[PDB]
Subunit: 363 residues, 4 copies
C-alpha cells in the first residue's frame, strides 16, 4: 500500500523514449537473434555449414541492406555472438544498426526448461547474473532486450502452473531490465501447434495475457517502458476449419483490447511459423480492424523476414545482392502492413508463400 519508486522520472523517460522509437509509425523489428543451434537448422536448409564466419556473413547481409529498409526497421534483435561481431569494414554490428536509424536489441534468456509435474510444459531460465549482463549490454550498444516463454494449447495445457510461473519469470526479467536502462520486450508465445480452432486460441491468449499484466503489476513494471511480443490469434496449424484474414485480425485485436493496458507502448507480433506473405497480410488486416487500438501494432519477425533471403543467398557470397533484395522486399511490405497500407501484387515467389511452421520451435 506504500510506493517505493522502482524508477526515477529520468529513468522512465529514457525507457519510454526507447520503446517509442522502436515502434515508430511504419517501423518494425528484425529478429535475427537465433542461437547457433537454431540458426544451424536454417543454414542446413541451404547446404551452408554452420560456422562462425557463415553466421557473421549472413547477419552482415541483413544488417547492411540498402537504405530503403531504414524507415522500415525500428529495431534489430541480435544473439550474444552477433552483438560482438563486425562487418567487413570493421564496424561493430551495433554501430551498423544505429547508423541506419535502428535501435539495438539483445536476447537474454537462456532457453526453456521442463516444469516437473506437467504434461510437457516449460518455463524459461536466464535470470542469474542478468543485472550485470544488462549493464554490460547497455554499455555495448543495446537499448532493449528479448526473453521468450513458450506455452502450448492442448487438453490440459496451458496449465495453471505454467501460466503463473511463466508470467512471473517474465515479470522478473522485465524488472531487472528496467533497472539497467533496457526496454524489455515481453514474449509469452502460445504455439500454433495443434488442431484447436480460432476461438480456442483467442480464449487461451486472453487468459495468458491477463496473467502476464497482473504479474507485471505485482512486480512494479513500468508498462510505457515495455513492449509486448505476442502470438497473433489464429487457429491451430492442424485445424480443419478455415478462417479469413479479417477474422484472424478481429480475434487478435479483440483479445488484446481485453487484456493489454493502453499504457503499453506497442505490440510487436511474432510470425510464429506463418509464411512471409501470410504474416504481412495478417498484420495488415490487424491494422485495418475497425476496433480502437491504443497501441502501435507492428512486427518483430524472425522467419517471416528471412525466408526468401536465406533461399536467395544459398550460402554463395555471389548471391549477396539477390539475397539482400528479398529481405528488403519483405521489410517494405511489413512496413506498409503495420500501417494498413499493404496489398500484395504477385511478386515474391513460392519462397514467400511456403509455410515456415516448425513443431516446438526453439531459438
Amino acid at each position: 500500500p506504500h510506493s517505493h519508486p522502482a524508477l526515477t522520472p529520468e529513468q522512465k523517460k529514457e525507457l519510454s523514449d526507447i520503446a517509442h522509437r522502436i515502434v515508430a509509425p511504419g517501423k518494425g523489428i528484425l529478429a535475427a537473434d537465433e542461437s547457433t543451434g537454431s540458426i544451424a537448422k536454417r543454414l542446413q536448409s541451404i547446404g551452408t555449414e554452420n560456422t562462425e564466419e557463415n553466421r557473421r556473413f549472413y547477419r552482415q547481409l541483413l544488417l547492411t541492406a540498402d537504405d530503403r529498409v531504414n524507415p522500415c526497421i525500428g529495431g534489430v534483435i541480435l544473439f550474444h555472438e552477433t552483438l560482438y561481431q563486425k562487418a567487413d569494414d570493421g564496424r561493430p554490428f551495433p554501430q551498423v544498426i544505429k547508423s541506419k536509424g535502428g535501435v539495438v536489441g539483445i536476447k537474454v534468456d537462456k532457453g526453456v526448461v521442463p516444469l516437473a509435474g506437467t504434461n510437457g510444459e516449460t518455463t524459461t531460465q536466464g535470470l542469474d547474473g542478468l543485472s550485470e549482463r544488462c549493464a554490460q549490454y547497455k554499455k555495448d550498444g543495446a537499448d532493449f532486450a528479448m526473453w521468450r516463454c513458450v506455452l502450448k494449447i492442448g487438453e490440459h495445457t496451458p496449465s495453471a502452473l505454467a501460466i503463473m510461473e511463466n508470467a512471473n519469470v517474465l515479470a522478473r526479467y522485465a524488472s531487472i531490465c528496467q533497472q539497467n536502462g533496457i526496454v524489455p520486450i515481453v514474449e509469452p508465445e502460445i504455439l500454433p501447434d495443434g488442431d484447436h480452432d480460432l476461438k480456442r486460441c483467442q480464449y487461451v491468449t486472453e487468459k495468458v495475457l491477463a496473467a502476464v499484466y497482473k504479474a507485471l503489476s505485482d512486480h512494479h513494471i513500468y508498462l510505457e517502458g515495455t513492449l509486448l511480443k505476442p502470438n497473433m490469434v489464429t487457429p491451430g496449424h492442424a485445424c480443419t476449419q478455415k478462417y479469413s484474414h479479417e477474422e484472424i485480425a478481429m480475434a487478435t485485436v479483440t483479445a488484446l483490447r481485453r487484456t493489454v493496458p493502453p499504457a503499453v507502448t506497442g505490440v510487436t507480433f511474432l510470425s510464429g511459423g506463418q509464411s512471409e506473405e501470410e504474416a504481412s497480410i495478417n498484420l495488415n488486416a490487424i491494422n485495418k480492424c475497425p476496433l480502437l487500438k491504443p497501441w502501435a501494432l507492428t512486427f518483430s519477425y524472425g522467419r517471416a523476414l528471412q525466408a526468401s533471403a536465406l533461399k536467395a543467398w544459398g550460402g554463395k557470397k555471389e548471391n549477396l545482392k539477390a539475397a539482400q533484395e528479398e529481405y528488403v522486399k519483405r521489410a517494405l511490405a511489413n512496413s506498409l502492413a503495420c500501417q494498413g497500407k499493404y496489398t500484395p501484387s504477385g511478386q515474391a515467389g513460392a519462397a514467400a508463400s511456403e509455410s515456415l511452421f516448425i513443431s516446438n520451435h526453439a531459438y
Copy 2:
C-alpha cells in the same frame, strides 16, 4: 485451458449496447440511489422528515426535470424503493426515465461488512439471491446495476486481503448481473480520507484496479458489457500539499491507462465528496488530458449533481422549479465536462 461460453453472441450484444448507450458522447449518470439511511443526513440538513413521500417527491423532482437534461443523462441509478414508485401523474419512475432517453439502473449491494483481522477494512455483501433479484429488476425496467466496494488509504491499508476480497466479490456480482441481461457497473472506491498525497493515491488506485481486472478475467467477465466507477486520483482530504486540476487529471488518466483494458466500454467517475464545481472542473481536465484514452470518461454523480438542488428544495413543494433548475445546471455542466468543453513531463507520474 478450455472455454465454456458464459454468454451467447446475443447476450453479449445486448450488454454491449446497453453499456454504450449509458456513456454515449456527452452523457453521464445521475446517481439517485441513496437508501433511507444514507439520505437521512441530507434531509436532516434541510429540516425535512425522512418519509417515503418526501423521498418520492424529491426523486420525482429530479427525474421530471425539464428536457434540457435529456442529452446530459444517459442513465439514472435508483434505490429499490424508488424503482417501484410513481410520479403524481401515475407514470412509474422507470417509465419517466426512459421517456427522457435514459437507461434505468438499480443499486443491488447490501452495504459493507467488517473484515476480521484488518484495521477497520471492509468487503461488501449482497450476493445471496442476487440472480433472482436481477431477473426481477430486469423485468421491471432496469438494464444496469450498481455495487459499491470501499477501500481506505492508511498506514497498513488497503491490505492484500482487502484488495483481493473486494476484487473477487465485485467479479461475482459482475458475473451474476451479466447472466441476467444487466450491465454491471464495477465500483472499487478508494476513499479520499487521510493526509496522503497524489502519488500515494495514484499508486494505490493502480494496484486496486489491476487486482479488479485480474479478478474480472478469472471470473470470465465480458468487459465490453461493463462500466468502471472509480474514484478520480486525488490527494487525501487532509493533505497539506496542493495540486492543480491538470495534475489530478494527469494522475487519474495515467492510472487508468496502466490498468483498464481498452475493451471496457466506459469509466463513470464517482464525485466522492468533491463539490459540484470541483467535480465538474476535474472531469473536464481529465477529458482535456493530452494522453490517449480508449474509453469514455464521464460521470456517475450522486452528491455532485444534487447539492444545490436539495438546498433549493428545502423540502418545500413551492421550491420545485427552483430546485430542478439547480440540478439542470449541474447536468449541463458535467455534460460539457465529459467532453472537455466546460469552463469553471508525464514521466513524473
Copy 3:
C-alpha cells in the same frame, strides 16, 4: 506484515474448547441438518408425507435415543427449522442434545449457485447477514456451524476458478463464524461422481485442501477453532478399477498429512453416499492407517447414520423403538470406527 488481532485470547479459548469437545476421543457428529427439499425424497421412499410434524417426529426420534449414543455423539447438526422445534416433553431440541452431552450445530449456507463460464460448476451462497444470524443462533444454543461447498471431478473440473472461489467463500464464512463464538466446520466436498480412479481423487483432494488452507490463512482464520469436513479419498462411484479399504485409508490419510496443518483440531468425514457399513469400515481403516495423524479423525455422517433408522421407522409411530435401535447401532459402530476398534464381526510411496 502487520497483525490486527481478529480474536482475543478469551475468544480463542472458547472456540478451541468447543472444537475439542465435538471431536473428543470416540465421538463424532450426527448430521440431521437436511432441509425440506433434501429430506423430501428421503421421507418419500418410505411413503411418509413431508410435513412439519413428521420431520419433527423423525428428528425427535434420533435426538432422544437412549444414553448409549451419548459417548458416540460429540455434536449434532440441525437445520434452522429443527433448532426451534420441541420434543413431546416441551423441551427445545437444542436442550435435548446438550443434556445428552452433545454440542449443538446449525447449517448456515444457502445452497449452491452456478458459476457462469464453467462446465456446471458451483460456488455457495449465504454470507449476507450471516453475522447477525450467527449471533442469534449462538444465543439460541448453537456453538458450531456447517457450510457446504461442492466440487466435481470431470474432464475439465474442478477448474481453477471453482477451487479459488469455493476456498474463498469458505474462508469468509469461517471468519464471520469465529467473530460470533461459533466454531466453523469447513466443508469442501469433492463429489464421488464419475469414473475417475483413486489416484485422481487423491490428487484433486490434495489441490483443493491446499487452496482451502491458504485461503483460511489469507483471511486470518484461527485453525484451532475450526474443524474440517472433507470427502474421504475414494475411487469414483463408477470407477471400473476396484480398491481395498486399506488403499482408501492410505490415500485419505496421505492427502490429509500433505495439506492439513496440525493446528486443525479435527477432521469429520462426510459419508458421501457410502453405505452405512462401508462408511464405518473405511473410517476404521483410516484410523488404523500406519501413518501419523496429528488430528482426530472422526465422522460427520448424515445418510450413513440414518439409512436403517429411516427404513425401520417407515413413518409409523409404533416403530419408534425399532428405528432408534438401528440408529444406535450405527452410532456405536462409528464410535468404535473413529478409534480403529471397529470390527463387523507398507510402500506408501505409491501414493
Copy 4:
C-alpha cells in the same frame, strides 16, 4: 485437475529415505557451507588468512572430529569448493562424512538480489543450469541441497511481492532438486533484525510459511522428500520487551503447527545469530513444548556449532585438538536438545499465541 506424476514411486522412496536419515532421532545438521566471502569475516576475526588451504584445514577439523559426533550429525552441508577437497589421508570429504554416518549436502543458491520497487527487499537467484548442477552433485556424493531466501520485518516488509516471489523461487528450486534425486531443504529465513516483538515475528512467520507451502503445492513438490529450515520465532534484536525460552518455544511450535503439513519430514532450525548456548536451550525448549509436533524438530546450525571451535583454533595447527573439542561439545549438546534431553549439566497459556 489432472495429475502428471513428477516422480515415480522409486524416486519418492529415495527422497523420503534420505530426508528421514538426515533428521533421525538425536541427529541434526552441521552447516559448514560458508562461501569464501562469508567465511572471510570469520577468519580475520581469528587472525587467519583466507586461503583455500586454510579453509580446507578448518573444514577438515570439523569433519574429522572423533566418533562422538556420529550419532549427533545426520547431515553436513558443504560449499562447492569443499565438496571436492580431500582430507590429509587423501579421502574425499564426502567420503569422510559418509563413513561417519552422515549424509552430504550442498548449497546451490547464488545469493540474494534486490527486488526493484521494494524497501530494500530481495529474492534469490541460482536456478540457471541448476538441473545439470544437481545431477553432477548427486553423482559426486551429495544427497540434499540448501537454498536461502531472506525476508525482513520492517514498517512495510515483508511485502506481498517479496513473500510471493521468494516462495515461488523456493518451489522452483525444490522441483529441480527432486527431479535429480536431491532432497531440497527449503530455507525462508526471516531475519531477527529490528525492534519488533514476539507476536510480530510469529505473525510474519505464519504468513510466510503458509505462502511457502501453497507454492510447493502449486509446483507439485513431494513434501515427504523435503525438509524445512526456518528461523525460530523470537523477538527482534532491538526489542525492549523480554521473553523466556518457553515463550519462544511456544510461539515457534504454534507457528509451525498452523502452517507446516505433517507430511514434511523434518524442521531444521537455523541459529540466526543466537549464541551457541542460546540456540541449544531454545531448541531444547522447543522439543519440550507440550503441543503435538508431527515432524522432527532438530538443528541445521552454522555459527551455533562453530563459534567456539573457530576461536579455539585461532588458525594454529597446535590448537586442532582443542578446536575440535569445542565443536564436539556443541554437537553433543544440540543432539540432546533435538530430543528435549538437554540440561546445563553434563549429559545428565496457549491461547495467548
